[PDB]
Amino acid sequence: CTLKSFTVEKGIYQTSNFRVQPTDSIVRFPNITNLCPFGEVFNATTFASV
Amino acid sequence: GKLQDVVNQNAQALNTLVKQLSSNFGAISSVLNDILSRLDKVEAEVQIDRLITGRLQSLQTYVTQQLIRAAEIRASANLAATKMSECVLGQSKRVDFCGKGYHLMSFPQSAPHGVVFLHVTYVPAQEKNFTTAPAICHDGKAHFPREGVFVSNGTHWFVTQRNFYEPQIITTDNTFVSGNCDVVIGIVNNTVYDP
Amino acid sequence: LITGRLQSLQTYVTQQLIRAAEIRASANLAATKMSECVLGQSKRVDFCGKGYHLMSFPQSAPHGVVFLHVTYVPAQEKNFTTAPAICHDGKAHFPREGVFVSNGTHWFVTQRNFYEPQIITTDNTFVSGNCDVVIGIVNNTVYDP
Amino acid sequence: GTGVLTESNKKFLPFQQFGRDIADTTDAVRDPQTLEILDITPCSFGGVSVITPGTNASNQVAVLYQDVNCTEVPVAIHADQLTPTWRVYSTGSNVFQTRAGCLIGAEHVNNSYECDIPIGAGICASYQTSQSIIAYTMSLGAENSVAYSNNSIAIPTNFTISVTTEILPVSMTKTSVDCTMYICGDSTE
Amino acid sequence: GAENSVAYSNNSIAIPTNFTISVTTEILPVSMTKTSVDCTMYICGDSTECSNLLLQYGSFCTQLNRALTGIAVEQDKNTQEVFAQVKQIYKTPQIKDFGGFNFSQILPDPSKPSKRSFIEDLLFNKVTLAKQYGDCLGDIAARDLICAQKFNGLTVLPPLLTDEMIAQYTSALLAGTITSGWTFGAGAALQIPFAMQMAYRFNGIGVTQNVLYENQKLIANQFNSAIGKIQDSLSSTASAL
Amino acid sequence: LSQGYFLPFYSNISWYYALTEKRVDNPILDFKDGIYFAATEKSN
Ligand SMILES: *[C@@H]1O[C@H](CO)[C@@H](O[C@@H]2O[C@H](CO)[C@@H](O)[C@H](O)[C@H]2NC(C)=O)[C@H](O)[C@H]1NC(C)=O
Ligand SMILES: *[C@@H]1O[C@H](CO)[C@@H](O)[C@H](O)[C@H]1NC(C)=O
Ligand SMILES: *[C@@H]1O[C@H](CO)[C@@H](O)[C@H](O)[C@H]1NC(C)=O
Ligand SMILES: *[C@@H]1O[C@H](CO)[C@@H](O)[C@H](O)[C@H]1NC(C)=O
Numbered sequence: 079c080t081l082k083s084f085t086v087e088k089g090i091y092q093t094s095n096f097r098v099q100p101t102d103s104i105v106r107f108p109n110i111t112n113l114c115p116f117g118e119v120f121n122a123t124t125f126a127s128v
Numbered sequence: 129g130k131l132q133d134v135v136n137q138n139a140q141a142l143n144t145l146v147k148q149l150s151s152n153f154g155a156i157s158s159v160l161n162d163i164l165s166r167l168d169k170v171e172a173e174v175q176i177d178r179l180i181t182g183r184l185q186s187l188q189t190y191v192t193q194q195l196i197r198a199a200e201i202r203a204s205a206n207l208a209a210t211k212m213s214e215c216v217l218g219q220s221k222r223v224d225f226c227g228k229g230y231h232l233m234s235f236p237q238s239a240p241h242g243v244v245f246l247h248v249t250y251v252p253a254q255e256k257n258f259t260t261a262p263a264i265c266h267d268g269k270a271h272f273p274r275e276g277v278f279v280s281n282g283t284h285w286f287v288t289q290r291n292f293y294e295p296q297i298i299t300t301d302n303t304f305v306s307g308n309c310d311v312v313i314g315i316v317n318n319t320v321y322d323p
Numbered sequence: 324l325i326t327g328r329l330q331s332l333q334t335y336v337t338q339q340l341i342r343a344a345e346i347r348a349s350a351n352l353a354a355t356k357m358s359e360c361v362l363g364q365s366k367r368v369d370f371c372g373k374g375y376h377l378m379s380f381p382q383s384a385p386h387g388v389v390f391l392h393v394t395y396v397p398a399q400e401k402n403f404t405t406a407p408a409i410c411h412d413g414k415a416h417f418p419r420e421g422v423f424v425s426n427g428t429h430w431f432v433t434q435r436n437f438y439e440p441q442i443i444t445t446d447n448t449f450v451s452g453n454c455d456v457v458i459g460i461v462n463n464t465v466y467d468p
Numbered sequence: 469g470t471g472v473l474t475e476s477n478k479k480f481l482p483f484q485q486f487g488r489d490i491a492d493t494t495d496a497v498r499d500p501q502t503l504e505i506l507d508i509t510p511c512s513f514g515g516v517s518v519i520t521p522g523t524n525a526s527n528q529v530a531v532l533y534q535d536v537n538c539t540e541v542p543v544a545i546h547a548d549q550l551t552p553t554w555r556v557y558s559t560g561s562n563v564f565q566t567r568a569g570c571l572i573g574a575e576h577v578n579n580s581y582e583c584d585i586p587i588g589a590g591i592c593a594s595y596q597t598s599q600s601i602i603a604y605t606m607s608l609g610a611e612n613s614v615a616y617s618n619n620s621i622a623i624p625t626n627f628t629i630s631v632t633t634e635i636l637p638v639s640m641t642k643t644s645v646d647c648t649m650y651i652c653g654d655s656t657e
Numbered sequence: 658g659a660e661n662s663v664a665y666s667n668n669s670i671a672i673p674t675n676f677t678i679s680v681t682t683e684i685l686p687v688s689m690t691k692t693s694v695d696c697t698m699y700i701c702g703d704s705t706e707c708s709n710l711l712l713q714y715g716s717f718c719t720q721l722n723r724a725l726t727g728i729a730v731e732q733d734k735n736t737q738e739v740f741a742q743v744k745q746i747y748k749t750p751q752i753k754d755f756g757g758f759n760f761s762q763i764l765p766d767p768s769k770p771s772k773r774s775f776i777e778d779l780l781f782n783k784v785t786l787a788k789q790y791g792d793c794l795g796d797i798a799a800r801d802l803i804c805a806q807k808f809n810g811l812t813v814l815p816p817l818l819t820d821e822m823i824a825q826y827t828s829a830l831l832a833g834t835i836t837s838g839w840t841f842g843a844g845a846a847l848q849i850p851f852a853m854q855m856a857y858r859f860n861g862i863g864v865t866q867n868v869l870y871e872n873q874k875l876i877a878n879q880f881n882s883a884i885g886k887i888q889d890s891l892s893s894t895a896s897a898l
Numbered sequence: 899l900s901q902g903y904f905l906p907f908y909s910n911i912s913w914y915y916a917l918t919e920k921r922v923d924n925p926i927l928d929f930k931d932g933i934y935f936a937a938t939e940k941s942n
């Protein structure tokens with residue numbers, strides 16, 4: 079597959095990686111559960127002037 | 129094969145140069161017609177520039193590889209010209225330069241993108257053991273051979289050419305005298321002949 | 324990122340090919356040294372050692388070869404009065420090998436690279452013509468057995 | 469990212485999350501929940517060689533794993549996640565340890581021949597006799613001790629005249645390149 | 658350089674009366690290191706998106722990796738065509754009665770467990786090189802230079818000939834050239850005493866062989882101490898490496 | 899060279915059949931990234 083031919087000849091060939099593929103996916107975030115105050119950054123009574 | 133791979137090193141670079149035309153190089157397609165028929169002038173320029181840069185890099189890579197191969201081929205051609213000048217046009221005393229053995233002649237023949245030499249050389253075949261001495265003390269004076277060495281088959285001593293067995297009797301025209309016969313280490317005792 | 328790293332790899336391969344060509348030239352030179360000096364004796368000047376080359380001894384080295392070229396050099400030269408030829412009795416006498424030298428009174432034949440003075444004998448010389456066309460020929464007697 | 473994760477101890481600073489290396493890749497990361505310093509190793513193992521005869525000779529190969537020690541081959545290849553046709557090539561009874569890593573799939577013989585497929589560190593391989601791939605120490609040549617004495621010489625009495633053939637390349641093909649037709653033939657833009 | 662005007666006259670010659678035998682050291686590179694490159698590891702190791710994007714660049718890595726393997730095979734060929742001149746390995750003679758010549762520093766010794774000569778051992782010690790998979794895997798708290806280039810696909814290949822085989826080749830060549838002269842380089846090896854070989858070589862350089870034997874023991878000394886000078890040229894902080 | 903969701907060579911195919919014993923095979927199976935369904939029969 080790395081020599082780009084269906085018939086390899088007699089010898090020793092270095093090889094690019096194809097054998098192993100990932101299967102699982104791991105996600106790990108810090109243990110924080112506080113919902114962010116989007117009810118005060120957005121939907122406030124008055125904003126500041128520009 | 130030493131010639132054939134050279135051809136296989138030049139017919140392969142052109143084939144890879146052709147097959148590198150079917151490369152996106154980061155563009156949307158590898159075909160100029162698709163880009164020029166699907167995108168307007170302002171938007172297709174950034175794609176054609178990618179194709180131009182990729183194909184220019186491929187051409188420069190091919191030229192650099194051809195320069196490397198031309199340098200190697202020129203070194204081999206210089207060696208071949210030296211071999212033609214020093215072995216076909218004459219006779220070389222250089223060891224192993226033209227054939228295995230003492231070089232006698234060489235004949236050149238042509239070949240596709242190359243030259244071939246038939247080096248005809250001389251090799252010894254059937255060696256024989258002998259008992260040898262560096263000099264002969266005849267009557268107090270050492271005798272050294274002019275060409276060849278002293279050898280003995282067990283009883284008598286002979287002068288011999290160093291590359292072929294041609295035993296000749298010890299005669300004063302085959303040897304020259306130099307000093308006393310006690311300073312030489314390993315000198316044996318015999319009589320020389322004077323005509 | 325792909326274009327930059329591919330250009331970096333191409334640059335590395337090009338420099339490696341240049342260095343491989345230089346190393347191959349050096350290895351061809353080393354093989355010629357091994358064939359023409361270890362396996363024999365070379366008359367090429369300064370090819371193997373400074374002086375007249377006698378032998379070569381090969382030793383290995385990390386990614387390389389080293390040669391011990393053992394050679395012959397002259398040590399103590401001496402001045403002598405020389406002549407191209409000797410007119411013995413109307414005919415010139417040229418030496419076969421060596422040169423005619425003199426220490427002031429007598430003339431000797433000598434090897435070209437070592438001082439081995441020998442008396443003038445007709446087996447050391449050969450005659451050619453008469454002694455009126457050679458420039459600088461001196462007068463002496465050539466002994467014969 | 470993508471890789472394998474191993475427990476290690478690189479002694480991160482307290483206000484640190486990942487540690488780079490000299491190639492600006494994530495050499496290690498910190499677990500945000502267990503506060504544990506993990507270690508990232510690339511999944512691929514470039515450095516594998518396949519030793520084969522011709523395709524129209526046999527569908528049999530030997531695998532050389534470079535600069536590894538054969539007991540830790542399955543943890544360097546990650547043989548648990550491979551197909552079993554790979555997993556037969558990670559362990560077996562044909563394992564031979566060389567100075568260039570070690571070789572699985574070719575039996576090692578104590579004989580020495582001239583070699584066809586050079587493997588390295590003096591080890592070569594060939595396809596011999598049923599038929600299998602063998603690996604062996606390369607034979608430098610025929611051992612021949614020459615006699616020597618202080619009063620003995622050898623002189624030839626007969627000779628041979630030989631003709632040897634030497635092939636030298638002289639030239640290669642001459643090529644010329646049209647830039648416009650190569651880069652974009654028939655396009656004014 | 659040093660200014661030196663040589664005398665000259667039309668009837669004056671200079672002839673040597675004594676000689677010196679010298680040993681000159683010449684160092685030649687033969688091979689360079691063989692490297693192999695995996696494009697996927699170097700450009701983007703373990704990334705399927707960038708690998709898919711790299712597939713759209715064509716044969717820029719098959720061509721890239723073909724040149725390096727040709728270089729590696731060329732280096733193996735260079736070492737083979739330098740050292741393996743003769744395929745008949747000649748064993749070292751058991752007795753060193755070479756007319757007084759002492760080939761101790763250049764011939765191998767079985768006592769030291771390397772099968773290399775003294776001078777070869779000095780040359781191996783003078784050259785300072787600039788690894789095993791498993792040392793990189795362990796906790797080392799600082800990534801090595803070799804381990805960083807091994808995880809990026811830049812592996813280095815070992816040479817085909819070990820140092821032991823090259824030392825064997827040089828030992829065979831040296832035994833052939835001290836036990837047979839130049840005859841083993843052209844056909845079969847022909848035995849000859851070393852004094853007679855030196856007589857042959859003085860005849861080659863242009864002097865008669867009678868000046869050899871009459872100085873033979875002296876010549877041996879002028880060889881032997883010269884080899885000792887090589888020690889002074891290699892052990893005492895050499896720069897020829 | 900094409901990357902994609904392919905069926906690997908010599909992969910573990912799970913096999914079901916209808917033989918009257920007296921069993922039909924219409925179970926419920928996971929559709930992960932596409933499937934390869936090969937059917938051999940006589941009377942459709
Ligand atoms: C040859 O020369 C050496 C150098 O002086 C002599 O000494 C030997 O040197 C080697 C080192 O290569 C040591 O291993 C030996 O133990 C030394 N031997 C002695 C007796 O000192 C050596 O003796 C000389 N050889 C001969 C045959 O004279
Ligand atoms: C904004 O927040 C107020 C309470 O503070 C809530 O009554 C209202 O529904 C929110 N949303 C708006 C104004 O869109
Ligand atoms: C000379 O004699 C030795 C021992 O008797 C023998 O080994 C060798 O083959 C002989 N011939 C040679 C050196 O040509
Ligand atoms: C040696 O050569 C001489 C010279 O012809 C001959 O007479 C003799 O028989 C040979 N053999 C021996 C053993 O001397």
Ligand SMILES: *[C@@H]1O[C@H](CO)[C@@H](O)[C@H](O)[C@H]1NC(C)=O
Pocket residue numbers: 313314618619754
């Ligand atoms: C040659 O070597 C032998 C070794 O036994 C010795 O007996 C003989 O005297 C030596 N010949 C010489 C030094 O001329």
Ligand SMILES: *[C@@H]1O[C@H](CO)[C@@H](O)[C@H](O)[C@H]1NC(C)=O
Pocket residue numbers: 265316317318
């Ligand atoms: C040869 O002559 C020398 C000098 O007279 C003598 O010493 C020696 O013994 C002789 N050789 C033999 C074998 O008798």
Ligand SMILES: *[C@@H]1O[C@H](CO)[C@@H](O)[C@H](O)[C@H]1NC(C)=O
Pocket residue numbers: 400401402664671
């Ligand atoms: C030879 O004579 C010249 C002229 O005076 C002198 O300079 C030189 O030292 C002499 N000796 C040699 C060349 O050995």
Ligand SMILES: *[C@@H]1O[C@H](CO)[C@@H](O)[C@H](O)[C@H]1NC(C)=O
Pocket residue numbers: 426427428429
């Ligand atoms: C020159 O050499 C001869 C040869 O014996 C010698 O007699 C003479 O004393 C030497 N010196 C001179 C000045 O002639």
Ligand SMILES: *[C@@H]1O[C@H](CO)[C@@H](O)[C@H](O)[C@H]1NC(C)=O
Pocket residue numbers: 458459667668
């Ligand atoms: C050498 O040159 C001198 C002048 O320096 C001259 O007197 C002499 O005749 C010359 N010798 C010849 C020409 O033989």
Ligand SMILES: *[C@@H]1O[C@H](CO)[C@@H](O)[C@H](O)[C@H]1NC(C)=O
Pocket residue numbers: 410461462463
């Ligand atoms: C040598 O001989 C020639 C010819 O007879 C003569 O002219 C010349 O003077 C002689 N040399 C001397 C030194 O007398």
Ligand SMILES: *[C@@H]1O[C@H](CO)[C@@H](O)[C@H](O)[C@H]1NC(C)=O
Pocket residue numbers: 108109500501502
């Ligand atoms: C967060 O959850 C993990 C397990 O889900 C627990 O072990 C940890 O103590 C929690 N708190 C943190 C990381 O502050």
Ligand SMILES: *[C@@H]1O[C@H](CO)[C@@H](O)[C@H](O)[C@H]1NC(C)=O
Pocket residue numbers: 537538539
């Ligand atoms: C690694 O290989 C060596 C052989 O040089 C061996 O002694 C050692 O036990 C191996 N390491 C293992 C098996 O963990």
Ligand SMILES: *[C@@H]1O[C@H](CO)[C@@H](O)[C@H](O)[C@H]1NC(C)=O
Pocket residue numbers: 578
């Ligand atoms: C091959 O050599 C090894 C080295 O010790 C030995 O253990 C083994 O038995 C040998 N195999 C044979 C002779 O078949």
Ligand SMILES: *[C@@H]1O[C@H](CO)[C@@H](O)[C@H](O)[C@H]1NC(C)=O
Pocket residue numbers: 253625626627628
């Ligand atoms: C020399 O060898 C040739 C064949 O190589 C043979 O025909 C011839 O008879 C031999 N001559 C002698 C004298 O041995």
Ligand SMILES: *[C@@H]1O[C@H](CO)[C@@H](O)[C@H](O)[C@H]1NC(C)=O
Pocket residue numbers: 398674675676677
């Ligand atoms: C030649 O030189 C060596 C040392 O270089 C010395 O030992 C020897 O005595 C000298 N011989 C003569 C004849 O001057």
Ligand SMILES: *[C@@H]1O[C@H](CO)[C@@H](O)[C@H](O)[C@H]1NC(C)=O
Pocket residue numbers: 910
């Ligand atoms: C296919 O999967 C089943 C699931 O239990 C397993 O029993 C079987 O061994 C697998 N086949 C192969 C060839 O591994």
